[PDB]
Amino acid sequence: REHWATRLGLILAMAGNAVGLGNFLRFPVQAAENGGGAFMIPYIIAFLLVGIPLMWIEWAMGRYGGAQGHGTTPAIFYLLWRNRFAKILGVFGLWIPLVVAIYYVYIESWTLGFAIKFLVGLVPEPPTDPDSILRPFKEFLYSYIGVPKGDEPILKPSLFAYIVFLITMFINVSILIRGISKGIERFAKIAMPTLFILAVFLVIRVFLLETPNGTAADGLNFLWTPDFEKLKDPGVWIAAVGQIFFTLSLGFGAIITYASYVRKDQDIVLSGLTAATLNEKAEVILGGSISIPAAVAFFGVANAVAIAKAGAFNLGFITLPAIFSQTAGGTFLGFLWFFLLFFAGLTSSIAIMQPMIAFLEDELKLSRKHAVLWTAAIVFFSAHLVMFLNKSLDEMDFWAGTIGVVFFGLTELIIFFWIFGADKAWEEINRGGIIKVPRIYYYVMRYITPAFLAVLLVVWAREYIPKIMEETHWTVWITRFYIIGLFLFLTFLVFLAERRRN
Ligand SMILES: C[N+](C)(C)CCOP(=O)(O)O
Ligand code: MET
Ligand code: NA
Ligand code: NA
């Protein structure tokens, strides 16, 4: 089996996995919609009772399976529990990262295209009216991704966006095709430091933004000022948990696959804790100090929150660059922003394609080159659905990146810490650890976490089940049909692997 060359490289690779578009895009939006500081408490708790324990659990399962030559859940679930249904459940550790990869890499290509155009200096040019400043950039983004005027099921992506998507796929492939230590690690050791530098620079520059309508400091206060009136709102807790899952790459099967390349005897405790901590730092300190403080700086708090609620991409791809355009050297600043976004996205995308690649390599005994090329082919092909079909992206992000990751987290936790046994699991987690997990967490993993997640899933199901059946748009039914197809495909591949074993 292939392994990480150094501990540093491992740390930065896992951190690259975690730290991504979820930090600089999803987080600011989630925190803004949820009332700033009010969102932070549930966010921190969710980080302690969910993110950390699941992170460790996934590192442990990953290394455990990796020792036996298995980097994916279909096999690992079977090692931990002997059943066919364990494999069928394991299929999600493929389906999820694939589905997410499909749209995620596309958004990444967006950030790349914007990076290029902002570098070369082709951007809308604003003239004191907010709408006259934002409109040009809204039109810019819409032209880029081909957004329809009314609500029209069909998207018309510009040739440039398509070509940039191809390029992005090529970059992902060129990194992935060189393997774990040479391709992923070597890139992480660069991209990560570059990312931190750019993020710090942007944070400072933004902090320097002050106008008659507000300041960045106001945004920081808004984000860090506690509000206890929202603690009774379940939605805030649900959003916090979702954000924790997404940002830490939990339930994506990615952490597990990365961990399967850690040597059996190496410590996953301190490495895991370090990766998670790095992610949280990149999220709350960096991600939260850029977009929101700038939006609040120019348009004030109320308007910043309104913009945040307007959409996820509205803040990152429209508002922020429109704000930058009003400052000296704002175009270059925008460029730095989108470049940061790009590296952050790439480091994650490689991570989510790696599970499929690893299933092909381990189970179907394919060479790395072939596995990577086929994974790339599948992702690229399926991506046309997200590119040309309006609302498809949201649907995939929902079923995979939202519900699926939680369901899968609960599933893996239940299999590892219950069926496989709690004591054996604990011993497996602490084994070889440079430091040991606090005893209390044993009771957190076995009782608190699974109960919390189960409750969450119950609420979610209760709310969504009625809504699902009545939905007007055909694009979402097409997307559902297709991703179900992907699930059948993956299940079939698992079947073939199983047969090959015999
Ligand atoms: C999960 N199941 C009970 C339907 C099938 C189990 O089959 P097997 O893994 O015991 O052979
Ligand atoms: C594409 S890997 C899962 C999401 C990633 N952790 C992020 O926040 O961007
Ligand atoms: Na990343
Ligand atoms: Na993250």
Short mmCIF file of C-alpha atoms and ligand atoms in Angstrom, two decimals:
data_model
loop_
_atom_site.label_atom_id
_atom_site.label_comp_id
_atom_site.label_asym_id
_atom_site.label_seq_id
_atom_site.Cartn_x
_atom_site.Cartn_y
_atom_site.Cartn_z
CA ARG A 1 0.00 0.00 0.00
CA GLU A 2 1.06 3.60 -0.61
CA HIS A 3 1.78 5.82 2.40
CA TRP A 4 2.37 9.45 3.36
CA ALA A 5 6.06 10.35 3.25
CA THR A 6 6.20 12.64 6.28
CA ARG A 7 3.97 13.64 9.20
CA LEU A 8 4.00 17.27 8.07
CA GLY A 9 2.88 16.29 4.58
CA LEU A 10 0.12 14.17 6.10
CA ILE A 11 -1.06 17.07 8.27
CA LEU A 12 -1.08 19.54 5.38
CA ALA A 13 -2.81 17.03 3.10
CA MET A 14 -5.61 16.43 5.60
CA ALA A 15 -5.80 20.18 6.23
CA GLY A 16 -6.08 20.73 2.49
CA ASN A 17 -8.87 18.18 2.54
CA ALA A 18 -10.74 20.03 5.30
CA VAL A 19 -9.96 23.67 4.41
CA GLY A 20 -11.78 24.71 1.24
CA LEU A 21 -14.75 26.47 -0.34
CA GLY A 22 -16.75 25.60 2.77
CA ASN A 23 -14.56 27.93 4.83
CA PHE A 24 -14.61 31.07 2.68
CA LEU A 25 -18.08 30.67 1.14
CA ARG A 26 -20.48 28.40 3.03
CA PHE A 27 -19.41 29.49 6.52
CA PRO A 28 -19.81 33.28 6.16
CA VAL A 29 -23.29 32.70 4.72
CA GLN A 30 -24.36 30.24 7.41
CA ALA A 31 -23.07 32.49 10.20
CA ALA A 32 -24.66 35.61 8.70
CA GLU A 33 -28.08 34.01 8.17
CA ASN A 34 -28.00 32.63 11.71
CA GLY A 35 -27.31 35.92 13.47
CA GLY A 36 -23.53 36.13 13.81
CA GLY A 37 -22.39 35.32 17.33
CA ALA A 38 -25.66 33.49 17.96
CA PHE A 39 -24.50 30.89 15.44
CA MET A 40 -21.05 30.53 17.02
CA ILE A 41 -22.04 28.84 20.30
CA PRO A 42 -23.94 25.99 18.61
CA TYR A 43 -21.07 25.92 16.12
CA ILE A 44 -18.45 25.42 18.82
CA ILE A 45 -20.48 22.82 20.72
CA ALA A 46 -21.16 20.96 17.47
CA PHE A 47 -17.41 21.06 16.87
CA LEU A 48 -16.68 19.47 20.24
CA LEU A 49 -19.44 16.85 20.37
CA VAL A 50 -19.52 15.95 16.67
CA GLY A 51 -16.61 17.14 14.54
CA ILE A 52 -13.75 15.99 16.76
CA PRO A 53 -15.09 12.53 17.73
CA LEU A 54 -16.17 11.75 14.15
CA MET A 55 -12.83 13.03 12.86
CA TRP A 56 -10.97 10.63 15.15
CA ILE A 57 -13.36 7.79 14.31
CA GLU A 58 -12.78 8.30 10.59
CA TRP A 59 -9.01 8.47 11.00
CA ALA A 60 -9.21 5.21 12.95
CA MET A 61 -11.43 3.37 10.47
CA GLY A 62 -9.29 4.69 7.64
CA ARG A 63 -5.98 3.51 9.09
CA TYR A 64 -7.56 0.22 10.19
CA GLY A 65 -8.84 -0.59 6.71
CA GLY A 66 -5.68 0.74 5.10
CA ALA A 67 -3.56 -1.70 7.08
CA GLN A 68 -5.42 -4.51 5.32
CA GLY A 69 -5.26 -2.81 1.92
CA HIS A 70 -8.71 -1.21 1.91
CA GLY A 71 -9.20 2.55 1.71
CA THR A 72 -12.95 2.69 1.11
CA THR A 73 -16.08 2.09 3.20
CA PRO A 74 -17.57 -0.75 1.14
CA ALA A 75 -14.68 -2.97 2.28
CA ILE A 76 -14.01 -1.38 5.67
CA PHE A 77 -17.63 -1.64 6.83
CA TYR A 78 -17.32 -5.32 5.96
CA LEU A 79 -14.11 -5.74 7.94
CA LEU A 80 -15.77 -4.12 10.96
CA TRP A 81 -19.06 -5.95 10.47
CA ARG A 82 -19.61 -9.02 8.31
CA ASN A 83 -22.69 -8.46 6.18
CA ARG A 84 -23.76 -7.74 2.60
CA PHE A 85 -25.80 -4.84 3.94
CA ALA A 86 -22.58 -3.44 5.41
CA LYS A 87 -21.21 -3.25 1.88
CA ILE A 88 -24.46 -1.80 0.56
CA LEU A 89 -24.19 0.86 3.27
CA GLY A 90 -20.53 1.26 2.40
CA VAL A 91 -21.57 2.26 -1.11
CA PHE A 92 -22.40 5.70 0.31
CA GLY A 93 -18.72 6.32 1.04
CA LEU A 94 -18.34 6.34 -2.74
CA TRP A 95 -21.66 7.75 -3.93
CA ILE A 96 -21.39 10.78 -1.63
CA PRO A 97 -17.84 11.91 -2.54
CA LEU A 98 -18.59 11.31 -6.23
CA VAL A 99 -21.85 13.27 -6.23
CA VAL A 100 -20.27 16.11 -4.26
CA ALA A 101 -17.19 16.08 -6.49
CA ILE A 102 -19.41 16.56 -9.54
CA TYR A 103 -20.65 20.07 -8.67
CA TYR A 104 -17.83 21.00 -6.30
CA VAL A 105 -15.16 20.80 -8.99
CA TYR A 106 -17.41 22.95 -11.18
CA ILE A 107 -17.61 25.70 -8.56
CA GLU A 108 -13.84 25.37 -8.27
CA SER A 109 -13.55 25.94 -12.01
CA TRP A 110 -15.67 29.05 -11.44
CA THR A 111 -13.12 30.37 -8.96
CA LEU A 112 -10.34 29.58 -11.45
CA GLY A 113 -12.04 31.41 -14.31
CA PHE A 114 -12.72 34.43 -12.12
CA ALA A 115 -9.09 34.31 -10.96
CA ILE A 116 -7.89 34.42 -14.57
CA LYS A 117 -10.24 37.20 -15.72
CA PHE A 118 -9.46 39.31 -12.65
CA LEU A 119 -5.74 38.78 -13.17
CA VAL A 120 -5.83 39.77 -16.84
CA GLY A 121 -8.10 42.61 -15.79
CA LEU A 122 -11.27 41.85 -17.72
CA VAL A 123 -14.03 42.75 -15.27
CA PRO A 124 -17.16 44.91 -15.13
CA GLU A 125 -16.33 48.54 -14.38
CA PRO A 126 -18.58 50.32 -11.84
CA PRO A 127 -18.79 54.15 -11.72
CA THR A 128 -22.68 55.75 -5.16
CA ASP A 129 -25.79 53.62 -5.67
CA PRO A 130 -25.29 50.05 -4.36
CA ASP A 131 -27.41 48.49 -7.11
CA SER A 132 -25.38 50.20 -9.84
CA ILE A 133 -22.22 48.79 -8.25
CA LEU A 134 -23.50 45.23 -7.73
CA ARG A 135 -25.52 44.90 -10.95
CA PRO A 136 -22.48 44.78 -13.28
CA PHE A 137 -20.98 41.93 -11.25
CA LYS A 138 -24.27 40.05 -11.02
CA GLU A 139 -24.48 40.28 -14.80
CA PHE A 140 -20.85 39.18 -14.94
CA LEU A 141 -21.46 36.01 -12.93
CA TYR A 142 -24.73 35.26 -14.73
CA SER A 143 -23.01 35.63 -18.09
CA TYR A 144 -20.22 33.37 -16.88
CA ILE A 145 -22.42 30.49 -15.72
CA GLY A 146 -25.30 31.27 -18.08
CA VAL A 147 -28.11 32.12 -15.67
CA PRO A 148 -31.59 32.54 -17.25
CA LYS A 149 -33.61 35.77 -16.95
CA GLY A 150 -36.75 34.38 -15.33
CA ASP A 151 -36.59 30.95 -13.77
CA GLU A 152 -35.66 28.80 -16.75
CA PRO A 153 -34.61 25.14 -16.29
CA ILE A 154 -31.77 25.46 -18.83
CA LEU A 155 -28.34 27.01 -18.20
CA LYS A 156 -26.12 28.38 -20.96
CA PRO A 157 -22.50 28.29 -19.70
CA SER A 158 -20.09 30.43 -21.74
CA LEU A 159 -17.41 28.68 -23.78
CA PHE A 160 -14.79 30.18 -21.47
CA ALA A 161 -16.41 28.63 -18.38
CA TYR A 162 -16.51 25.24 -20.10
CA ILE A 163 -12.87 25.40 -21.21
CA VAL A 164 -11.86 26.51 -17.72
CA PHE A 165 -13.76 23.52 -16.35
CA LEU A 166 -11.77 21.24 -18.64
CA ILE A 167 -8.55 22.89 -17.45
CA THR A 168 -9.58 22.47 -13.80
CA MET A 169 -10.24 18.78 -14.37
CA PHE A 170 -6.81 18.55 -15.99
CA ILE A 171 -5.13 20.11 -12.94
CA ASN A 172 -6.94 17.78 -10.57
CA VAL A 173 -5.83 14.86 -12.74
CA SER A 174 -2.21 16.01 -12.94
CA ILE A 175 -2.07 16.20 -9.15
CA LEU A 176 -3.95 12.96 -8.43
CA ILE A 177 -2.12 10.88 -11.03
CA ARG A 178 1.19 11.20 -9.18
CA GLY A 179 -0.15 9.36 -6.14
CA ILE A 180 -0.48 10.02 -2.42
CA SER A 181 3.04 11.12 -1.47
CA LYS A 182 4.32 12.58 -4.74
CA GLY A 183 1.13 14.12 -6.14
CA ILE A 184 -1.02 15.11 -3.17
CA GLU A 185 1.53 15.69 -0.41
CA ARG A 186 4.02 17.65 -2.51
CA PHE A 187 1.20 19.92 -3.67
CA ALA A 188 -0.21 20.32 -0.16
CA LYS A 189 3.15 21.50 1.20
CA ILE A 190 2.94 24.44 -1.22
CA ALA A 191 -0.75 25.21 -1.72
CA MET A 192 -1.42 25.20 2.02
CA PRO A 193 1.21 27.80 3.02
CA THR A 194 0.31 29.87 -0.04
CA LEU A 195 -3.32 29.68 1.06
CA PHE A 196 -2.61 30.78 4.63
CA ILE A 197 -0.49 33.69 3.39
CA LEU A 198 -3.14 34.90 0.94
CA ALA A 199 -5.85 34.49 3.57
CA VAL A 200 -3.93 36.51 6.16
CA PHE A 201 -3.16 39.24 3.63
CA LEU A 202 -6.82 39.47 2.59
CA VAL A 203 -7.93 39.48 6.23
CA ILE A 204 -5.68 42.45 7.00
CA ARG A 205 -6.54 44.39 3.86
CA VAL A 206 -10.24 43.85 4.58
CA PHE A 207 -9.79 44.88 8.22
CA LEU A 208 -8.46 48.17 6.84
CA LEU A 209 -11.81 48.84 5.12
CA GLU A 210 -13.79 51.68 6.70
CA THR A 211 -16.56 53.86 5.26
CA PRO A 212 -19.45 56.14 6.31
CA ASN A 213 -21.72 53.08 6.14
CA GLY A 214 -19.65 50.95 8.51
CA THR A 215 -16.36 49.15 9.10
CA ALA A 216 -14.90 45.65 9.00
CA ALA A 217 -14.58 45.88 12.78
CA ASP A 218 -18.36 46.17 12.92
CA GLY A 219 -18.62 42.89 11.03
CA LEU A 220 -16.15 41.22 13.38
CA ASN A 221 -18.16 42.43 16.36
CA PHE A 222 -21.39 41.24 14.75
CA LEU A 223 -19.86 37.81 14.16
CA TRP A 224 -18.29 37.50 17.62
CA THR A 225 -21.06 39.10 19.70
CA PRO A 226 -23.03 36.38 21.56
CA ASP A 227 -26.82 36.24 21.23
CA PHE A 228 -28.70 33.80 23.48
CA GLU A 229 -32.17 34.45 22.05
CA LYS A 230 -31.40 32.18 19.09
CA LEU A 231 -30.39 29.23 21.27
CA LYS A 232 -34.01 28.05 21.26
CA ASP A 233 -34.07 27.95 17.46
CA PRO A 234 -33.46 24.37 16.21
CA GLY A 235 -32.59 25.70 12.76
CA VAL A 236 -29.45 27.31 14.15
CA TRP A 237 -28.28 24.03 15.66
CA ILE A 238 -29.08 22.15 12.45
CA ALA A 239 -27.16 24.71 10.39
CA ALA A 240 -24.22 24.58 12.80
CA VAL A 241 -24.07 20.78 12.66
CA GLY A 242 -24.35 20.76 8.87
CA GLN A 243 -21.55 23.31 8.64
CA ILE A 244 -19.40 21.19 10.96
CA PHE A 245 -19.94 18.06 8.85
CA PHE A 246 -19.25 19.86 5.58
CA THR A 247 -16.20 21.86 6.68
CA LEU A 248 -14.42 18.94 8.35
CA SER A 249 -15.15 16.67 5.38
CA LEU A 250 -17.00 14.29 7.70
CA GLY A 251 -19.28 11.69 6.14
CA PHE A 252 -17.70 12.20 2.73
CA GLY A 253 -15.56 9.08 3.04
CA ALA A 254 -12.63 11.36 2.20
CA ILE A 255 -11.00 11.45 5.63
CA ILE A 256 -11.20 7.66 5.78
CA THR A 257 -9.49 7.25 2.40
CA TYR A 258 -6.75 9.72 3.33
CA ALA A 259 -6.30 7.86 6.62
CA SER A 260 -5.95 4.49 4.91
CA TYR A 261 -2.57 5.73 3.65
CA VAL A 262 -1.34 6.33 7.19
CA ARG A 263 0.93 3.53 8.40
CA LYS A 264 -0.65 1.17 10.93
CA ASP A 265 1.69 2.29 13.73
CA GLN A 266 1.54 6.06 13.12
CA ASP A 267 -0.48 8.38 15.37
CA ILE A 268 -3.88 9.48 14.10
CA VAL A 269 -4.88 11.30 17.31
CA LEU A 270 -2.62 14.36 17.32
CA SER A 271 -2.54 14.49 13.53
CA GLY A 272 -6.33 14.44 13.38
CA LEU A 273 -6.71 17.01 16.15
CA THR A 274 -4.15 19.20 14.37
CA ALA A 275 -5.94 18.99 11.02
CA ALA A 276 -9.32 19.78 12.58
CA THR A 277 -7.87 22.67 14.58
CA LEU A 278 -6.18 24.06 11.47
CA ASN A 279 -9.51 23.86 9.68
CA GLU A 280 -11.38 25.69 12.44
CA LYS A 281 -8.69 28.38 12.47
CA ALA A 282 -8.98 28.76 8.69
CA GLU A 283 -12.76 28.92 9.07
CA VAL A 284 -13.65 31.19 11.99
CA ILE A 285 -10.53 33.38 12.02
CA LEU A 286 -9.81 33.61 8.29
CA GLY A 287 -13.00 32.77 6.40
CA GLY A 288 -15.18 34.76 8.78
CA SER A 289 -12.94 37.83 8.77
CA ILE A 290 -13.07 38.46 5.01
CA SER A 291 -16.49 38.45 3.33
CA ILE A 292 -18.76 39.47 6.21
CA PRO A 293 -16.57 42.29 7.58
CA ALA A 294 -16.27 43.73 4.06
CA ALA A 295 -19.99 43.51 3.30
CA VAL A 296 -20.75 45.10 6.67
CA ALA A 297 -18.00 47.64 6.03
CA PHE A 298 -19.58 48.94 2.82
CA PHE A 299 -23.33 48.23 3.16
CA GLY A 300 -23.67 47.88 6.93
CA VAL A 301 -24.84 44.91 9.00
CA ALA A 302 -28.51 44.72 7.96
CA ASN A 303 -27.68 44.88 4.26
CA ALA A 304 -24.80 42.43 4.73
CA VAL A 305 -27.19 39.91 6.29
CA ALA A 306 -29.75 40.51 3.54
CA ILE A 307 -27.06 39.84 0.94
CA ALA A 308 -26.00 36.73 2.84
CA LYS A 309 -29.57 35.41 2.77
CA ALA A 310 -29.82 36.30 -0.92
CA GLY A 311 -27.61 33.33 -1.80
CA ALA A 312 -24.39 31.40 -1.20
CA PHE A 313 -22.53 32.59 -4.31
CA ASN A 314 -23.96 36.11 -4.13
CA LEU A 315 -21.55 37.12 -1.36
CA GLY A 316 -18.43 35.48 -2.78
CA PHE A 317 -18.75 35.98 -6.53
CA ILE A 318 -20.67 39.27 -6.62
CA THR A 319 -20.75 41.41 -3.48
CA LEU A 320 -17.10 41.05 -2.44
CA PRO A 321 -15.54 41.79 -5.86
CA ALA A 322 -17.98 44.67 -6.31
CA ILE A 323 -16.74 46.04 -3.00
CA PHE A 324 -13.11 45.54 -4.03
CA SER A 325 -13.72 47.37 -7.31
CA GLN A 326 -14.37 50.53 -5.29
CA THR A 327 -10.87 50.46 -3.79
CA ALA A 328 -7.42 51.21 -5.19
CA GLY A 329 -6.00 48.07 -6.78
CA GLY A 330 -9.33 46.35 -6.18
CA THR A 331 -9.09 44.16 -9.27
CA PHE A 332 -5.83 42.59 -8.10
CA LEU A 333 -7.39 42.13 -4.66
CA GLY A 334 -10.29 40.29 -6.27
CA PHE A 335 -7.73 38.17 -8.09
CA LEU A 336 -6.05 37.22 -4.82
CA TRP A 337 -9.48 36.37 -3.43
CA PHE A 338 -10.40 34.02 -6.29
CA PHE A 339 -6.93 32.46 -6.36
CA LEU A 340 -7.25 31.68 -2.66
CA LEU A 341 -10.69 30.23 -3.33
CA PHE A 342 -9.21 28.17 -6.16
CA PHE A 343 -6.40 26.56 -4.16
CA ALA A 344 -8.81 25.96 -1.28
CA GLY A 345 -11.19 24.20 -3.66
CA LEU A 346 -8.56 22.15 -5.47
CA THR A 347 -7.01 20.76 -2.30
CA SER A 348 -10.49 19.48 -1.39
CA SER A 349 -11.54 18.18 -4.81
CA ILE A 350 -8.49 15.94 -5.06
CA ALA A 351 -9.57 14.67 -1.63
CA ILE A 352 -13.12 13.79 -2.75
CA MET A 353 -12.01 12.09 -5.98
CA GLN A 354 -9.43 10.04 -4.08
CA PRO A 355 -12.11 7.75 -2.56
CA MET A 356 -13.31 6.60 -5.99
CA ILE A 357 -9.73 6.33 -7.23
CA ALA A 358 -8.87 4.21 -4.19
CA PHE A 359 -11.88 1.93 -4.58
CA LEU A 360 -10.82 1.28 -8.16
CA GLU A 361 -7.21 0.65 -7.16
CA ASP A 362 -7.85 -1.52 -4.10
CA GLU A 363 -11.00 -3.44 -5.03
CA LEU A 364 -10.83 -3.61 -8.83
CA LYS A 365 -7.02 -3.77 -8.80
CA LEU A 366 -6.74 -0.98 -11.38
CA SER A 367 -3.51 0.96 -11.86
CA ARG A 368 -3.39 4.49 -10.45
CA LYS A 369 -3.31 6.06 -13.92
CA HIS A 370 -6.39 4.17 -15.14
CA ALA A 371 -8.29 4.73 -11.89
CA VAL A 372 -7.62 8.47 -12.00
CA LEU A 373 -8.49 8.80 -15.69
CA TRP A 374 -11.76 6.89 -15.30
CA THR A 375 -12.75 8.79 -12.16
CA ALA A 376 -12.03 11.99 -14.08
CA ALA A 377 -14.09 10.78 -17.03
CA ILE A 378 -17.08 9.90 -14.85
CA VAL A 379 -16.95 13.16 -12.92
CA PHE A 380 -16.50 15.27 -16.06
CA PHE A 381 -19.35 13.51 -17.86
CA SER A 382 -21.76 13.74 -14.92
CA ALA A 383 -20.79 17.41 -14.53
CA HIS A 384 -22.77 18.34 -17.66
CA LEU A 385 -25.88 17.77 -15.56
CA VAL A 386 -24.78 20.45 -13.09
CA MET A 387 -23.59 22.76 -15.87
CA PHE A 388 -26.65 22.74 -18.13
CA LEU A 389 -29.41 22.04 -15.60
CA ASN A 390 -30.62 24.81 -13.30
CA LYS A 391 -31.22 23.75 -9.69
CA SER A 392 -29.37 20.46 -10.21
CA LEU A 393 -26.37 21.65 -8.21
CA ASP A 394 -28.56 22.53 -5.23
CA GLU A 395 -30.22 19.11 -5.37
CA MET A 396 -26.90 17.25 -5.36
CA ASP A 397 -25.61 19.52 -2.60
CA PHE A 398 -28.72 18.65 -0.62
CA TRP A 399 -28.99 14.88 -1.01
CA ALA A 400 -25.22 14.32 -0.87
CA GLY A 401 -23.54 17.24 0.87
CA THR A 402 -26.24 17.76 3.51
CA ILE A 403 -28.46 14.77 4.39
CA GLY A 404 -26.11 12.08 3.08
CA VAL A 405 -23.09 13.15 5.11
CA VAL A 406 -25.05 13.14 8.37
CA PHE A 407 -26.75 9.83 7.65
CA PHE A 408 -23.38 8.36 6.70
CA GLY A 409 -21.68 9.79 9.77
CA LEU A 410 -24.28 8.21 12.02
CA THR A 411 -23.97 4.96 10.06
CA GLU A 412 -20.18 4.74 10.33
CA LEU A 413 -20.23 5.73 14.00
CA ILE A 414 -22.82 3.05 14.74
CA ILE A 415 -20.89 0.38 12.84
CA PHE A 416 -17.50 1.22 14.37
CA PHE A 417 -18.37 2.11 17.98
CA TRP A 418 -21.38 -0.20 18.46
CA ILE A 419 -21.34 -3.29 16.22
CA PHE A 420 -17.56 -3.61 16.02
CA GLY A 421 -17.65 -2.83 19.74
CA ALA A 422 -16.85 0.27 21.76
CA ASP A 423 -13.76 -0.95 23.62
CA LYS A 424 -12.09 -2.39 20.53
CA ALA A 425 -12.90 0.84 18.67
CA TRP A 426 -11.46 2.99 21.46
CA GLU A 427 -8.29 0.91 21.68
CA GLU A 428 -8.00 1.12 17.89
CA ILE A 429 -8.33 4.91 18.01
CA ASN A 430 -5.78 5.49 20.76
CA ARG A 431 -3.26 2.93 19.50
CA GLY A 432 0.03 4.49 18.43
CA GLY A 433 -1.25 7.93 19.40
CA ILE A 434 1.33 10.55 20.33
CA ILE A 435 -1.35 11.79 22.72
CA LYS A 436 -4.47 10.02 23.97
CA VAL A 437 -8.12 11.01 23.59
CA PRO A 438 -9.64 12.34 26.83
CA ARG A 439 -11.64 9.57 28.52
CA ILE A 440 -14.84 11.64 28.44
CA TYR A 441 -14.96 11.43 24.64
CA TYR A 442 -15.46 7.67 24.93
CA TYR A 443 -18.88 8.44 26.38
CA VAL A 444 -19.38 11.20 23.80
CA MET A 445 -18.81 8.84 20.87
CA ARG A 446 -20.91 5.98 22.25
CA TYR A 447 -23.97 7.91 23.47
CA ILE A 448 -24.15 11.68 22.94
CA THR A 449 -23.08 11.92 19.28
CA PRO A 450 -25.22 9.11 17.79
CA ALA A 451 -28.28 10.27 19.73
CA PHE A 452 -27.78 13.86 18.61
CA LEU A 453 -27.37 12.83 14.96
CA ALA A 454 -30.36 10.47 15.14
CA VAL A 455 -32.56 13.27 16.48
CA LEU A 456 -31.31 15.60 13.75
CA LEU A 457 -32.10 13.04 11.04
CA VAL A 458 -35.55 12.46 12.51
CA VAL A 459 -36.38 16.17 12.43
CA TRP A 460 -35.00 16.56 8.90
CA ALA A 461 -36.95 13.56 7.61
CA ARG A 462 -40.13 14.79 9.30
CA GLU A 463 -39.84 18.15 7.54
CA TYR A 464 -38.66 16.99 4.11
CA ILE A 465 -40.71 13.84 3.43
CA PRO A 466 -43.88 15.80 2.58
CA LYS A 467 -42.00 18.39 0.50
CA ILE A 468 -40.10 15.86 -1.61
CA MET A 469 -43.13 14.29 -3.29
CA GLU A 470 -44.53 17.65 -4.33
CA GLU A 471 -41.90 19.50 -6.34
CA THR A 472 -42.73 21.19 -9.64
CA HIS A 473 -39.40 21.33 -11.48
CA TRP A 474 -38.32 18.43 -13.72
CA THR A 475 -34.62 19.27 -13.42
CA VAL A 476 -34.60 17.98 -9.84
CA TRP A 477 -36.32 14.74 -10.85
CA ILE A 478 -33.73 14.30 -13.60
CA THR A 479 -30.95 14.89 -11.07
CA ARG A 480 -32.48 12.47 -8.57
CA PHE A 481 -32.95 9.82 -11.24
CA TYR A 482 -29.35 10.25 -12.38
CA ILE A 483 -27.70 10.13 -8.95
CA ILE A 484 -29.80 7.09 -8.08
CA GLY A 485 -28.37 5.64 -11.28
CA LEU A 486 -24.89 6.44 -9.98
CA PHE A 487 -25.76 4.58 -6.78
CA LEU A 488 -26.82 1.51 -8.78
CA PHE A 489 -23.61 1.77 -10.81
CA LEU A 490 -21.39 1.91 -7.72
CA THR A 491 -23.33 -0.94 -6.11
CA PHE A 492 -22.69 -2.95 -9.28
CA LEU A 493 -18.96 -2.18 -9.17
CA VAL A 494 -18.91 -3.32 -5.54
CA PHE A 495 -20.61 -6.52 -6.69
CA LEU A 496 -17.94 -7.08 -9.35
CA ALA A 497 -15.17 -6.52 -6.81
CA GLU A 498 -16.82 -8.95 -4.40
CA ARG A 499 -17.01 -11.56 -7.16
CA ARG A 500 -13.38 -11.00 -8.15
CA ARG A 501 -12.41 -11.69 -4.54
CA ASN A 502 -13.99 -15.15 -4.72
C1 LIG B 1 -28.08 -8.06 4.92
N1 LIG B 1 -28.81 -9.28 4.57
C2 LIG B 1 -29.23 -9.92 5.81
C3 LIG B 1 -29.99 -8.94 3.77
C4 LIG B 1 -27.94 -10.19 3.83
C5 LIG B 1 -26.76 -10.79 4.53
O1 LIG B 1 -26.06 -11.75 3.82
P1 LIG B 1 -24.70 -12.31 4.38
O2 LIG B 1 -23.66 -11.21 4.37
O3 LIG B 1 -24.90 -12.80 5.80
O4 LIG B 1 -24.26 -13.44 3.48
C1 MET B 2 -14.93 18.86 -1.21
S1 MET B 2 -14.38 18.02 0.46
C2 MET B 2 -15.88 18.55 1.60
C3 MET B 2 -16.01 20.06 1.71
C4 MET B 2 -14.75 20.75 2.24
N1 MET B 2 -14.43 20.28 3.58
C5 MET B 2 -14.95 22.27 2.22
O1 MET B 2 -15.23 22.88 3.25
O2 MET B 2 -14.83 22.91 1.18
NA NA B 3 -9.22 22.34 0.39
NA NA B 4 -13.34 23.13 5.82
#
